[PDB]
Ligand binder design. Structure first.
Ligand SMILES: CCCCCCCCCCCCCCCCCC(=O)SCCNC(=O)CCNC(=O)[C@H](O)C(C)(C)COP(=O)(O)OP(=O)(O)OC[C@H]1O[C@@H](n2cnc3c(N)ncnc32)[C@H](O)[C@@H]1OP(=O)(O)O
Ligand SMILES: CCCCCCCCCCCCCCCCCC(=O)SCCNC(=O)CCNC(=O)[C@H](O)C(C)(C)COP(=O)(O)OP(=O)(O)OC[C@H]1O[C@@H](n2cnc3c(N)ncnc32)[C@H](O)[C@@H]1OP(=O)(O)O
Ligand SMILES: Cc1cc2nc3c(=O)[nH]c(=O)nc-3n(C[C@H](O)[C@H](O)[C@H](O)COP(=O)(O)OP(=O)(O)OC[C@H]3O[C@@H](n4cnc5c(N)ncnc54)[C@H](O)[C@@H]3O)c2cc1C
Ligand SMILES: Cc1cc2nc3c(=O)[nH]c(=O)nc-3n(C[C@H](O)[C@H](O)[C@H](O)COP(=O)(O)OP(=O)(O)OC[C@H]3O[C@@H](n4cnc5c(N)ncnc54)[C@H](O)[C@@H]3O)c2cc1C
Ligand SMILES: [Mg+2]
Ligand SMILES: [Mg+2]
Lengths: 611, 607
């Protein structure tokens, strides 16, 4: 049982952010984007949203109810037929090449538009996008490769090969540097990779593709320890003719298990055995240099952006499903007539707690969309210059700062607020007939893969703030302050934002203080760890509230100018969301600041036996 | 062993060292049950739960029940039926049952502690085993003749259902349209379709099922006050001997496909739609259906909250066991050194934060449902609290929506932390936490949604009650606060009590102001759930602080070994909860004080 047409898209909100808030249309028709105009970008969003609501979403239930089957003798996976049909619709429209470099066959576009297009695939059937990331990986291989490797990357992108990122081992998940997979140099300059990797997404994909590029982290014999000792290797499923791309003999890299998961069931998550079956796993050193963790983080950065966007896309369709249900479900009387047991029955959108729930879902779904689109505006130097006036170096540091927010805050928030979406359906929300319970199961992984929330929060504080000397964080804070410092119709929202900004500044000062104290009392560093996730989530709430308030300011201007009809309703909802978020979400940061200011190490000193 | 990890030590700590329930064991109703026998019963059912009950937890979810339209029956997986037989063969479906129906008299606090284990190990197993408890409720509401039937049903172990919901009547029970038509012989013919009925068929577990059905007699008035309650058995039977006779006209017509709790068959139930009457008997031969059914709803709400709490507890203990053995990363004090020794993940601050959050909420929630249960027996409430029967009943009624609403919501939320502790392995069906999450999502929905719990709590259990039960509990918190080692915790509790008092006053003002400005009432609705949750957090903090005060006493008296570790953990949990959970209530109070109707005035099309 399940909903075929489950996916409800929101192109209108995407276009509002892209063009009316962030002004991405400034760069369309100019420089890198000379051949792409605003009308064409809008048509592309409508087209992929239609394909996503149709053929891609059509197999969302099927992939979960009839999941992939592993044959351990052939080391291959069979995917359900309807899901492969969805994949073919993706390929036939070129949607595995969104934002691929022109020289690899893509259409040049700003990253903000690229991720808005991808949002639709991730909301309709996110595993379909994951299987379709091969050309994107080919582009990363190209950028990191030798001249000869760039030839192979060009073939792979043209032919649409699939791809995997192969880091994790049973003893090396968060601690990538603990990996033991080894690389043995051959006299001809190739390497033989030996080891067993775990949890590898898409490591086999039935007959979707002619080949799969495994990008594998391994430790050359005699290399040093930790991440710094790791190198990155191109390990193709099949050998091939490096001149023509013609597929050759099977390379020694074999799936040996497929996990049984809570959700994302149609994404084959695989134990991957390299050189264990009497056939060498030949690998080629990427770029013919030993620089593996740096190279692989080109991939990780994109995966983390995808995972946060996936969480956000899923909350959005969860909200729209809940809203559509609530508009039609009649239950109970209006609260003003509660005592009159003869009173007319009302649709549940008339109930305060349902409106509370729906506005909570709305404000977070729309605030998160704003966050990932804002982040993407720093991923092209030309867009960052045109829309923000920031140079390429600062833009890169701002993007790096925001990625743990997209991934960590996005994943955690989306899963939490889908609870409200399900609750809106009542008992029916617990049924597989409706898609919210699968959204919940499919999104639980988003706080775990591509680096757990705790790893995101440690990255955010230690690398993206401390190692950055606070430059990116100071830039964003300065933009929030400028908004606050400027019609008095958003006065209370600006005051609530000023309090939230000062709360987050207070948190940052407190955690920085603990870090400095650790120069003298090493254990003081634990308090940074204790507060790190709460700090990451606070910055996300602050950014959400600020971006919603910017959206409200645009909406006020459009209403003042004379918006009517569905436009008017849209703008009215932005004002209501920004106000609701400021009044109901932001004040909690004040208590969180005080909690962070009072952290102590009692919980660290407690005997493990006492838990 | 199995997936289910029990915590009899914490139950006994609460029952005996905190609340003093052993004070009533050996006296009056409980003349024949002593403290040692109570502890042995808890250990024994915990072992049953960890063993044969938990054994089919996975099987029930992976090989769920099948509806057969050829016979209008449901088939259950064989391994789950084996677990059910283990429950029946030890008499555990008679826990809390009246002595005249074959039970062992015991405090409700002990009853729910026993039930917690079955709810942790395989909650649908307890649901199918609720028949005797329902027979006792029928007994209590029945005529003298119906008491005879209820006695038979209890003795023979028949199953039971509570049959309220319809497609257009879930939260709004009073909108139900199922009809009851009186026959010349005084029976009734029940006609209608009910939805989402738990255990409406149960394969060959039982020889009969008692359906307790709400229906509206021809000519009755509208709403819940027009409803009556009917005894509608799956099979007719001899009212004297119990011998099973002809099939009655009450048939399951579908089984829902659910996120979790899959082995609980959740059925569309058709009454008098298959060409044979669904014969019902009016309960008590009086028309008083919603009041009668609330005897059942109260028990169901207590069960659902205890279920959620039981599940968080085994989630936590599974996560803890995993974390103690998982090696990953270096100690944070050696971050810079990429050669540092690897540590188990309990050494990482975020994992300790997560584990203490799970622990504090799991143990606070346990305290809350056991505290609640100490007001469910007049004799216990008198002995341990010094409160009379009338106030005990009102305090129990005040706390039930906390157990249900705050328990269900908190448990599901904090299981997120349990699963996170496992890392990527938590997303695997190899470990039980993802099933705990799926199975516990329903707890915020059936037996009344959280919103309905919060509206019950405020409108009925506070306003209609004139605040008497709420003032009693607040007075006990105040006394604890006013009473050295717990001075910081008492100060934080004082802030939280004042915060909850302010929320209650704001919401009351919004309600009373509705006399002159009708829309004012919407602000009560907007704040109701946050208020319910805030009270739950306050009660958690207070009860944890009371546990910490006992632990300090026991440590000063010379506790050693595993006792000492246990008491140290209680001190740590109370302190952590006071410092990291209670302060948020200050911001929630300010938010509630600032509620406005903008979100109610917004056009629906703007969402
Ligand atoms: C749009 C198209 C895109 C297409 C992409 C292609 C897709 C291919 C197919 C895959 C698609 C399927 C989707 C799968 C999604 C799930 C993916 C996974 O889980 S996969 C598994 C996911 N697994 C994880 O995500 C691992 C989670 N664990 C961590 O992230 C750890 O913190 C750790 C491993 C970094 C610690 O190791 P430790 O040694 O203490 O680390 P240190 O702090 O000392 O840094 C050392 C060096 O690392 C560097 N570098 C470090 N940080 C960053 C950064 N933020 N940022 C950048 N670079 C960073 C840096 O070089 C640094 O050197 P330096 O510049 O300082 O000199
Ligand atoms: C341990 C042994 C246990 C054995 C148990 C055996 C169980 C056998 C079956 C086993 C399977 C069942 C387990 C499965 C768990 C899920 C079961 C369900 O969902 S089932 C479906 C669960 N469905 C639900 O839970 C329905 C959710 N909906 C509600 O609760 C609504 O608020 C409503 C229907 C009450 C509103 O109707 P509205 O007419 O506006 O209400 P008003 O405010 O105007 O009150 C009218 C009358 O109702 C009365 N009464 C009311 N409240 C209480 C109370 N707290 N308290 C007491 N009584 C209460 C009261 O008589 C009052 O009259 P008065 O005293 O004032 O004169
Ligand atoms: C569905 C799925 C798909 C995946 N896809 C891929 C893939 O395609 N390629 C790939 O290489 N990997 C992939 N992974 C692996 C995934 O990235 C890891 O599961 C993740 O990094 C966590 O590692 P772990 O499971 O070993 O958990 P652990 O690292 O053992 O973490 C367990 C717990 O300890 C905490 N913890 C660990 N270290 C620290 C620390 N230093 N400080 C604080 N807390 C800490 C974690 O936050 C977590 O709560 C996938 C995993 C899943 C579940
Ligand atoms: C697994 C399962 C088993 C069940 N078992 C049984 C059983 O054995 N017997 C039985 O009789 N029923 C049973 N139920 C029915 C269950 O109690 C109802 O689903 C529940 O009461 C909610 O009703 P509903 O599904 O019609 O949701 P709705 O009442 O339609 O609620 C939808 C949404 O509106 C909100 N809402 C509704 N009215 C109000 C209001 N006045 N004010 C504010 N918000 C409001 C709800 O909170 C929810 O968010 C079961 C349900 C499930 C899911
Ligand atoms: Mg700027
Ligand atoms: Mg007392």
């Amino acid at each position: 049982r399940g909903s075929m047409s489950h996916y409800k898209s929101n192109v209108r909100d995407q276009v509002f952010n892209l063009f009316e808030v962030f002004g991405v249309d400034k760069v369309l028709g100019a420089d890198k984007f000379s051949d792409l105009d605003a009308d064409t970008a809008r048509e592309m969003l409508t087209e992929i949203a239609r394909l996503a609501e149709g053929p891609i979403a059509e197999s969302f239930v099927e992939g979960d109810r009839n999941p992939p089957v592993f044959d351990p003798e052939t080391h291959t996976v069979t995917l359900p037929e309807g899901f492969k049909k969805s994949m073919r619709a993706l390929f036939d429209g070129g949607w595995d090449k969104v934002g691929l470099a022109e020289h690899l066959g893509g259409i040049p576009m700003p990253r903000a538009l690229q991720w808005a297009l991808i949002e639709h695939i991730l909301g309709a059937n996110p595993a379909a996008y994951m299987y379709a990331m091969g050309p994107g990986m080919s582009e990363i291989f190209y950028n990191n490769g030798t001249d000869e490797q760039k030839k192979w990357a060009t073939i792979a992108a043209e032919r649409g090969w699939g791809a995997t990122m192969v880091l994790t081992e049973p003893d090396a998940g968060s601690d990538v540097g603990a990996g033991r997979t080894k690389a043995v140099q051959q006299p001809d300059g190739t390497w033989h990779i030996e080891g067993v990797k775990r949890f590898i997404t898409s490591a086999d994909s039935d007959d979707l593709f002619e080949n799969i590029m495994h990008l594998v982290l391994a430790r050359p014999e005699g290399a040093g320890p930790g991440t710094k000792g790791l190198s990155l290797f191109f390990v193709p499923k099949f050998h091939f003719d490096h001149e023509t791309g013609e597929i050759g003999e099977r390379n020694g890299v074999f799936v040996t298990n497929v996990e049984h998961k809570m959700g994302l069931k149609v994404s084959a998550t695989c134990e991957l055995s390299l050189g264990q079956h009497g056939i060498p796993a030949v690998g080629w050193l990427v770029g013919e240099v030993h620089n593996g963790i740096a190279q692989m983080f080109d991939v990780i950065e994109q995966a983390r952006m995808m995972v946060g966007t996936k969480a956000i896309a899923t909350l959005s369709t969860g909200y729209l499903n809940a809203l559509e249900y609530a508009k039609e479900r009649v239950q109970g009387a209006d609260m003003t007539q509660m005592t009159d047991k003869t009173a007319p029955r009302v649709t549940i959108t008339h109930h305060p707690d349902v409106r509370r729930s729906l506005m909570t879902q709305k404000a977070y779904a729309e605030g998160l969309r704003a966050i990932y689109l804002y982040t993407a505006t720093f991923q092209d130097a030309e867009v960052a210059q045109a829309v923000h006036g920031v140079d390429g170096d600062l833009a890169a540091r701002v993007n790096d700062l925001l990625l743990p927010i997209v991934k960590g805050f996005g994943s955690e928030t989306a899963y939490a607020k889908l609870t409200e979406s399900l609750q809106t359906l009542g008992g029916s929300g617990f049924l597989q007939d409706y898609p919210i319970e699968q959204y919940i199961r499919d999104s639980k992984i988003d706080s775990l893969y591509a680096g757990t929330t705790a790893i995101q929060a440690q990255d955010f504080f230690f690398r993206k703030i401390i190692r950055d000397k606070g430059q990116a964080l100071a830039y964003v804070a300065g933009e929030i302050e400028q908004f606050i410092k400027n019609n008095g119709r958003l006065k209370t929202e600006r005051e609530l934002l000023a309090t939230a900004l000062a709360d987050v500044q207070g948190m940052a000062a407190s955690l920085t203080g603990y870090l400095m104290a650790a120069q003298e009392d090493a254990a003081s560093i634990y308090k940074v760890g204790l507060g790190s996730v709460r700090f990451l989530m606070a910055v996300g709430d602050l950014l959400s509230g600020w971006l919603l308030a910017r959206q409200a300011a645009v909406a006020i201007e459009k209403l003042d100018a004379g918006a009517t009809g569905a436009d008017k309703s849209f703008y009215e909802g932005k004002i209501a969301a920004a106000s609701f978020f400021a009044k109901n979400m932001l004040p909690l940061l004040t208590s969180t600041r005080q909690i962070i200011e009072n952290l102590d190490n009692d919980v660290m000193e407690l005997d493990e036996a006492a838990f």
